[model samples]
Target: KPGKATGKGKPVNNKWLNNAGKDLGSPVPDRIANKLRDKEFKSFDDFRKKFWEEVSKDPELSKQFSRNNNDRMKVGKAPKTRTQDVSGKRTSFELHHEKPISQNGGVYDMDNISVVTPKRHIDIHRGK
Candidate 1:
């Protein structure tokens, strides 16, 4: 229903629009990106650098940094919510990290990790 441009113009690559955030990188997690998107930095590199610096500022924040549970479930690294067996016994578990991942803790290192009740896990952090 509309007419074309008045004059012939140089061809433009519309791909830049979609490419906007494509380079944020694996370390730039979606959570933090959402939190920080409103602030338009000078460049994508600046955004990533800010993300790493900010994430390192808090262990909880760092947890939001894509801790993909790859192979974690198979080895029982996943948290277990309360569930009653046929016999009616309740059970639960949580994979807690003594050394925060933000502090360079090994995600799968048993020495720095522990299995505790989810309730106890909350208590551990609350105590700190």
Candidate 2:
């Protein structure tokens, strides 16, 4: 007969959520941080709401947020491309990472990749 079942396993790690929390706080400006620390928010959700409102009202912050949002929207979709002849030969199109994952960039992140010709991709890797 098979052995009896084992006891319950350990709880799943909440590392991702913890890391997200850390990341969320990392980009917050000092002004926002000071405001939150000065008893401006009643709770975590309250702070989050005000944080977004504050970010949206700032042009620089809102632009950064929009740029990030656009990039994230590219994941899981085919990249856009145009064919162009290089060195008298038409090269095949290729999708390349805007920021290489080896450098701690996003995997399958839309804003992190771009379409290039095969020759262009090689040139890019060669630091040309």
Candidate 3:
């Protein structure tokens, strides 16, 4: 989140905010993201609520998961904006798979799914 001044009243561009992988940003490691697919949260709303609850109990962990680089990239630190995709025009986001274990699918493995924008996921689902 620390960076030079953008002159447009925004923080100057920071490399951590731009790239992917370890050096890409804060504590939410790529491995952690991959592991998230295996978690039991059934929906985005469930994940959000549980996540906040966990964070409330463990501030440091919350900071690692929701603040710093990953959160900054997904949801901007600014008052009203969320992070957009690399394209800048699209909100940077992800659609996690919610295939329950009872479905006979691999247990939430990252290989069983991916992180994609809602729009792209919808298109894929619609066979676009």
Candidate 4:
């Protein structure tokens, strides 16, 4: 294991926090947009609804959105546990925007995407 770390407390470096905030631009407020927090995303429905709303408002930010390897793997692994279908194997996970073209959002831009397994993706949108 990586063990907690060399020491108990990680150095407090506000610069990183401040820089990240600046990069994201405007402060997205904690109260109003608090749902943006990861804790709020309990289920796929929650993620879909909230994520779509965000994309509808700021499509550009959606373009910049991305998930780490962990999230990508999670989406793929989730469906495997759900159904016993192994006929089709998915090699990659793609982040799908909930507000897809049919909903008028248009385009498979990065913003309207989420890391999803091929199986779950098909189940959710009924398409590739």
Clashes of 2: 2
Candidate 1 lowest-lDDT run of ten: 1-10
lDDT of 2: 0.36
What tens-digit string does per-residue lDDT give for candidate 2 at 23-127?
111223434344333343333334334444554454543454334432432332211223332333443234455555588653333234333545565666777
In model 2, pairs of residues that clash are: 71-111, 74-110
Once fitted onto the true fold, the runs of candidate 2 whose alpha carbons sit more than 4 angstroms away are: 1-90
TM-score leaderboard ranking: 3, 2, 1, 4
**Whole-model lDDT, candidate 1?**
0.36
Candidate 1 per-residue lDDT, tens place, 21-110, comes to: 122101223343444444545543343344345434435543432344312333323323333211123233333556655897633332
| Reference-based TM-score, model 1 | 0.30
Clash pairs, candidate 1, are none
Tens-digit per-residue lDDT, 53-81, candidate 4: 55334433323334442243234322122
- Model 2, C-alpha of 26: deviation from truth (Å): 30
Give the per-residue lDDT of model 3 (tens digit) for 3-105: 1111111221222122221121222223334323345555444443333343234333334344443444343221112344333454443424435457854
Q: Highest TM-score among the candidates is held by which one?
A: 3
Stretches > 4 Å off in candidate 4:
1-87, 106-110, 126-128
Residue ranges of candidate 3 with Cα displaced over 4 Å: 1-30, 33-44, 48-92, 98-103
Q: Which residue pairs collide in model 3, if any?
A: 4-12, 6-12, 84-92, 85-92
